[PDB]
Amino acid sequence: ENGPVKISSKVNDKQVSEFLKDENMEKFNVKLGTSKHFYMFNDNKNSVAVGYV
Amino acid sequence: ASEVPQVVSLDPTSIPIEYNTPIHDIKVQVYDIKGGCNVEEGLTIFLVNNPGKENGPVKISSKVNDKQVSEFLKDENMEKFNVKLGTSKHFYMFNDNKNSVAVGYVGCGSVADLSEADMKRVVLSLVTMLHDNKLSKLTVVFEINVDKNLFRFFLETLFYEYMTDERFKSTDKNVNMEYIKHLGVYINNADTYKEEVEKARVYYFGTYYASQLIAAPSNYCNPVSLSNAAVELAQKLNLEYKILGVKELEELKMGAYLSVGKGSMYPNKFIHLTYKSKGDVKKKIALVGKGITFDSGGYNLKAAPGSMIDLMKFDMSGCAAVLGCAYCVGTLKPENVEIHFLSAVCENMVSKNSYRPGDIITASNGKTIEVGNTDAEGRLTLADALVYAEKLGVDYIVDIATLTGAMLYSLGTSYAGVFGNNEELINKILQSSKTSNEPVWWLPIINEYRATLNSKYADINQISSSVKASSIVASLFLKEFVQNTAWAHIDIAGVSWNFKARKPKGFGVRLLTEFVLND
Amino acid sequence: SEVPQVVSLDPTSIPIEYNTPIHDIKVQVYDIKGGCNVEEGLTIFLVNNPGKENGPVKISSKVNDKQVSEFLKDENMEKFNVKLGTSKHFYMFNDNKNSVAVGYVGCGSVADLSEADMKRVVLSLVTMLHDNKLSKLTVVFEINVDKNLFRFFLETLFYEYMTDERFKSTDKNVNMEYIKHLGVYINNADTYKEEVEKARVYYFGTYYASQLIAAPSNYCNPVSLSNAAVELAQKLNLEYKILGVKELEELKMGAYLSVGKGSMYPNKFIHLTYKSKGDVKKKIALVGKGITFDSGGYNLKAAPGSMIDLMKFDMSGCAAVLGCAYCVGTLKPENVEIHFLSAVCENMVSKNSYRPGDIITASNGKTIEVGNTDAEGRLTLADALVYAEKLGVDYIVDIATLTGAMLYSLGTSYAGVFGNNEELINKILQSSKTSNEPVWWLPIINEYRATLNSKYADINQISSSVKASSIVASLFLKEFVQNTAWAHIDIAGVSWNFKARKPKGFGVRLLTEFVLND
Amino acid sequence: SEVPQVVSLDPTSIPIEYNTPIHDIKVQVYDIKGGCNVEEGLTIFLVNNPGKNGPVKISSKVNDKQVSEFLKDENMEKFNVKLGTSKHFYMFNDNKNSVAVGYVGCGSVADLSEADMKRVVLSLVTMLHDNKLSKLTVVFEINVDKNLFRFFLETLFYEYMTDERFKSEYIKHLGVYINNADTYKEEVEKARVYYFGTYYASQLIAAPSNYCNPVSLSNAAVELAQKLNLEYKILGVKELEELKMGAYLSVGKGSMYPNKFIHLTYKSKGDVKKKIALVGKGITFDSGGYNLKAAPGSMIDLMKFDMSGCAAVLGCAYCVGTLKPENVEIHFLSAVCENMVSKNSYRPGDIITASNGKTIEVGNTDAEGRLTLADALVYAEKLGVDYIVDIATLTGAMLYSLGTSYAGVFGNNEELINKILQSSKTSNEPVWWLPIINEYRATLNSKYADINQISSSVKASSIVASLFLKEFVQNTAWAHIDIAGVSWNFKARKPKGFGVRLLTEFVLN
Ligand SMILES: [Zn+2]
Ligand SMILES: [Zn+2]
Ligand SMILES: [Zn+2]
Ligand SMILES: [Zn+2]
Ligand SMILES: [Zn+2]
Ligand SMILES: [Zn+2]
């Protein structure tokens, strides 16, 4: 309950993949409704945004 | 320890009080924004405004010491975000050292001089980014203009809102609470704002302390346990303290204060903390705080819809403010002042022993009072607490009380009202309001209503029978108990409790302390 | 054990009537296939006209008396219809030149008589029985009723006939005499004999519970009510245990103790056990709200319509459970172990009362923020539920006059049941049908759980915004049952018969049927 | 301007008495340093006792030996100076004519407040209402400055005047003795103008909602302007429709009397340094609309005074139009209508469009003032003014903040507020400054319209209304006086005409 966040799927972006490392998502829990999302740049220097709920 | 009575062996016998809060362990560093912002670990947040156009675009002005972070914060790349007061965005990137960092911003609108209300909202957005994120450091960059007093307000408000009070949680503790250990601040002319860091920390706990007292429910926080609480506080701060019990109170003929308590299972207790500076004493001050640990209303029970009897554990917010003040004063140690902290604590209850409506009682100054409504018990206790205050021979008497619910219909939940018999004292209070950033507003003592207190049998009516402006009439009533001393009276009934966040504000601690350190 | 008093005149015990006139009624069931003898007393026919709504009367049974048969000829009955609840009296002489009284009660045009229909007929009968000093009553069933419906006929007859005169002094009815014999003519009569005494037990279990409810709070207080349970347990030879304040503190029942802080009567926890001989296959805890008077506490019941003058009935759940204990104790079912529990107390206004806003600790360590002192029943029940689950039981069923909101959801006739286990809820419903005490399944809407999230304590006692009180309370109660099937019956609406100005003893039959047929 | 009727007995006009018995009283003020003369009528001395409720001691020099021997210290010791108490005796004077002499206690304070003055006067009027005299002479044995002396005159005239228009002996000469009497002669005539200005407002307010409706009230304003040579323009429904005043019109849809807007304007011959617009709430009866005043204490029977800010403005127009101050242009504005219950009424939840384009979600039809004033404020700012000052019986909350004596002033401009406050000091009409706390603005953020008409949470309704009204002044100094609590005199059961002298003093200053 209120456990940490762990993303399972594999993404097609080395930058986003780095961001989704398990060691990064621990900082966030899965409490129903809780959310965060970060703006970053993909492997092709274009603006993206990854997050979770 | 002075023993608290119990009905069952499970009744609490003490107020739980945390003195070593996680905010006391955060190391604060202040940097001058000139000479560059470095982007270390944790989260880095810019406070940005755009004068002129509302919802205008955000542009990062300060100099960052990282090519990658600079390229990421290029003005062309930031135009996609506006500065609407409260908005916030999180960024993620790698720095010059191929290390991941997190930065972001919080919008501060388009107005130049932010008010305390605006600062409150900016801080609330910061706290939101602190919660549900295991951060070791937060850094805030001031791309906005704030004077020294408003900058302190930012720190204190940050500290207060960041703190989470879990004293009464047992099986539902947030097993995810992790406070930061370090807090960086980048601001122009940083050397001048540095002096405010330690005062803000002191001001935070002083207010958080009163908050703990107020939120403590009436079975934990009762007249005995709360006076015990003050004793401990005086003891930690080497303050002088005397706690007057029923026996002396009878000797002192405090019939108004005692009547209100006749119906409680906890005997009345009168708190008197004293701070005397070591230098030549130039001003003597008595601060008086209403100390009703629970206000059922008495035989005038709080049964009318919207009476919020379930909130009445807060009818001792004035006493908490005053004790919170005592912490600040005891900690900061002003140099040429003598301060008395007073509170006539009791509990307004229904019993065979309670005083009744219609009862005529005699105040310690020999004036008899006809009780018209037992739910107006605060002005009765304060009347005796004021007589006691003038007997000490001070320069200023200032009382603070959750006195009248009318306050919600006059000034509301944001501004408290100040009444008094002395323009200069009322100006000092108004001055302390500006510097503390705790809003007060002067209201009149309209003498024309005095006649409606003319009891047919006693010396004076406790309540007006016709005038509906309760907050003024009570001021008229109190004024009859201060004969020759500058006295102001601050009604915090409307502003003490934060209905939206479901917690107390600690309102008044900083107002009162600033007043104490006034020219 | 000793009841405190303020003046020497305050009563120190609840007056309980154990041997009732009903118990001295010899009951005989005869088969209708052989004709009814009409020798003495009053003889009432239960008559239906399937189809024709308000149709005529026509007797179907053979009467073994030429005179009476003449009176019951269809031409003579033409003037009477079968309207449900209608009744008529007849007077004639029989072949033995003996005066006799005869009559009928209308059973409508529907063949399946509802529970509420049977009551209308029984009330009409009792009317003929009251203000009449005749020694025998005979009822001839010319309608079809199953075994459970017939028993319901007797239970309801016995209960409505009995008059509770425990508190009459100068105004006792002088010449009200109860019949001494009851005859019943019915098809397959042999099959219904089994139900006669079972009806008699159920009646008194219900009448017992009604006695405890009807008794006002000065007579029926926490000490005197717990004394009555022990005396009942001794007459039934049940294991019993009464926990006092000292043992309650040691069990850390903060929530239940807080409710009683303001009363002059110490809290008392009733624990009776019935254990079958041999192998035990079902262990059950029944829990009943036992507030001998609910004033509301500092949240006083002074709002218009808050019916403070009725709150002597806030121990109805406790009464239903003890009533169930009588039935189970008498009928001695096999292969079960039943615990009857009830955390008894009185919710009063004093310098010692708990206050709105207080934070108390339940016996499971959970802190609770009191938002309204008149929500006391779920505080007592939380500790009762933690106590019940510690017994290692298969089912926890609590019954309570908990929320007035039931007056707005189901009304006065149907109780509401909430639960965490479908199977258990199913059995409670089945038991509702064979006991003929109506219950309707209502949901525990989990979406409302968040409004109980207190800012400082582990839970709020009351939701601040949600008005569906009956559902919220069930959400609260469920936090105190961790891993057992638990159901909760809210009888706040169905407990008191406002029309008759007396209790119903609701729940006794339902709870006993639940225990017997498992 | 034809007043519709239900039956032929319905009144078609407001009875307005312009020539009062007050206006026929000749007054001259004499200096106390020349001796008191007791030739005729009743003579009253206003005396106080500093320090000690103490005994009355007469200080002035009376010119009649017979009256002198009666006011001896030994004779006056039996009477005290408790504020209001009084005594009067009948006697034969020096020349053997029946004179009457007495006193009125002025308490023990040297600085007599307005509230204290009112008490002294009522003691006087009580004496006049129980005696047939032709002359009253008041000896001032107390210190009052010029403004307080006038106020004494005004409130004396007002309290002395009794309104008998609806029912199916006065004096003719008044004498005043005061030190430095020349310094006070200036104020005598000002007092008359200030008296009638307020008694005129009092007449309109006391007029019940069947005599005083939007048609009969606007008519009365026109008749006033014509008797005072003021520029007047009355906008009817068709004009209001073309001007898109949806909020003002919304409030009126349920009335049998069409909305009528009053413009009465005044321009002086000199250099114009300040143009001021005066706005006043003119709801001729406030049923509450579908939010009916059915709650106990609603005081629906009193709601004929919900046009007290209008009456104040029109009373100010009389005063201005009479005195003709120099160097000012003043517009007198009032969106008058009636808030009633009908199939044609607006409903709670209705969304309406103000004349400046802003849509408004109506939350409570009994807060109609906000709406009529919103369009009236848009109007006012379009006249290009320096100051917009509106005055309304706006929020019942006032009874719990300042009470029945002091009114509330809110505004967006400190310089304008201070002028209001100063005007309260010289008119002696008490007024207190309250804040427009911006932190509550967010409660007015409607979910569907541009703005909510009311907060559903904030109980500081007077500040919330202020927050709402301010959104209809875009760039003009604007103050807002809430007289909901001070406008009616409950003990006396009559109106006060509060705000006329205050607003007149504003324009002069
Ligand atoms: Zn109170
Ligand atoms: Zn209080
Ligand atoms: Zn209750
Ligand atoms: Zn209850
Ligand atoms: Zn209105
Ligand atoms: Zn209105």
Author numbering:
A (entry chain D): 138 to 190
B (entry chain A): 85 to 603
C (entry chain C): 86 to 603
D (entry chain F): 86 to 137, 139 to 254, 262 to 602
In the authors' words:
We produced more crystals of PfA-M17Inactive and soaked these crystals with a zinc solution prior to data collection. An energy scan of the soaked crystals definitively showed that only zinc was present in the crystals. Merging data from multiple datasets collected at the zinc edge successfully illuminated the anomalous signal. To our surprise, when we solved this crystal structure using molecular replacement, the position of the zinc at site 3 was absent and zinc atoms were evident in sites 1 and 2 as seen in the “active form. Comparison of the electron density clearly shows a distinct change in the density for the zinc atoms; however, this time, the anomalous maps could confirm the presence of two zinc atoms. The change in the metal coordination site between sites 2 and 3 was accompanied by a significant movement of each L13 loop, returning L13 to its active conformation that permits substrate entry to the active site (RMSD = 0.185 between the aligned L13 loops from chain A of both structures). This novel structure, named PfA-M17Zn2+soak, reveals in situ evidence for the dynamic nature of L13 and the contribution of the metal ions to loop movement. The inactive conformation was metal dependent, as when we soaked the crystals in zinc, we changed the affinity of the metal sites and the protein returned to an active conformation, with both the metals and L13 in a conformation ready for hydrolysis.
